[PDB]
Symmetry: C6
């Protein structure tokens, strides 16, 4: 085979930014967020980006932090479908702009 | 040898989607799911995909979340063999469709 | 040096499948399994494979789950040397068959 | 495919150094820092660099450690916008100077 | 830059096998082993190899398990300098033999 | 893109060895070491190297273990600036000598 030594470092990337309107009570309960709200999901690298994204999203629309995970880089917000959608949209563009992140497409699940 | 610096980032992939009808009480107990039900197993990357897959599966058939792990990316559902099988099938195609994931084949264990 | 971006994803592999007859009480105590039994050890990737392997092994011979680790991908079974050996043999082939895993040789420690 | 063996080792890098004036009480509460203060965010590799950066930042301006994470390599400081900004600026240059780290640009979020 | 997708899997390797005679009470306390004994240190990949090595070492000489870590792949034994040395020597060769591991040199610290 | 399978294994490396005289009470408190002492910081791979380095440093000068982390590979010592400096110096050379590690430069923060 081949042996390579590899100095690892975090990349800067928004891997997914997903909207889920009408998650349902079971999923909501599992996730640890309020029922009857839309939901925004982001994975971020490095993990500390979640605090930055948290700031952005809060300032972008009327959304709330379900939870913020500075280790995994997870961030979950909730609120109206419209608020969550804007918050997501704004936060992705803000990261590529302020920090020149690798970005992704915003995605959605409905029904 | 050779030294490479490596900025790591999560891939987007469904690595496995497996059905297990008749798991048995011992395995069920270990896994932390009800007995007398079929079982669906998925590994997902990044870990946060488990919440998205959770949504999809719940909406695809009459299945329930045994547990959802947004860290490892694990998701276990249960229900009838038919319900679990459809939920699995739907969830994989839904991820490749909505999010353009790398997908896998659905698999099964019976007896 | 060189900078590479690396999207990571789990491989599908059975890295080891080892039989240990006569482990002794000290090792058994450390491992958290009954004394006076043979022992089967498997490392699996991804971690969720341990539930699938758990199913296979239980169905292959008269063995029992010492523990199943869906995070590390560890699975430890115990029983007679013959039962453990068959369970191991069957589970490896089953994974390569059902899921086309990268497989390994079965190994053993005696005395 | 291809098989490579990879001996992993930590790189030496400041991946981000971000200033957030006016984070808001919600974000502040989530993050575990005082309200009404600016905030500095750094990700560092290896994780132990957070203690070194902690030293630098404290000595650079009138800032305080919200928290220091020698595992993830996270470090959060707070104080006036001016103090936090200087602390950040100084700490980045200090690491590249003393330890020849790979550095980044300082960034900021306002409003 | 360059983007590579990387399916990760554990290698099979004994990275170090080190003997420490006369560790001293402070170090011993930190490590969580008895004082007045020599000490053997191994790092193993995958993590589950520690249980196999544990078996080998116990059978090779009159040594005892300080602790066995099936997650990190750590294994610490203790006993006489001679017993620990033989246990180490035997365990390394046993792994390369039974499992065709990548091996290392045995090392020692004295005084 | 490109798919590579990657068997991972720990490298053997001292990534940093840093001296901090006059850390201050705040930083000291955060770090979990006594005030009014100099401080030595090392990151080591693999994680188990921290026990070996712990032995070396203790034997090299009149220093004490603030803490030893066999998981992350962290080791923090304290004592006089001179004792800590020698302990660090000795431990790095000892590792390259006994174990042929990849080494680093010793570094320091003063004032």
């Amino acid at each position: 085979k081949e042996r390579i030594i590899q100095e690892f470092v975090p990349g800067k990337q928004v891997t997914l930014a997903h909207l889920i309107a009408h998650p349902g009570e079971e999923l909501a309960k599992k996730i640890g967020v309020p029922d009857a709200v839309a939901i925004g999901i982001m994975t971020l690298t490095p993990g500390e980006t979640a605090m930055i994204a948290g700031d952005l999203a809060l300032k972008a629309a009327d959304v709330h932090i379900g939870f913020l995970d500075r280790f995994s880089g997870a961030l979950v917000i909730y609120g109206s479908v419209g608020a969550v959608e804007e918050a997501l949209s704004q936060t992705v563009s803000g990261l590529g702009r302020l920090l020149n992140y690798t970005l992704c497409e915003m995605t959605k699940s409905l029904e």
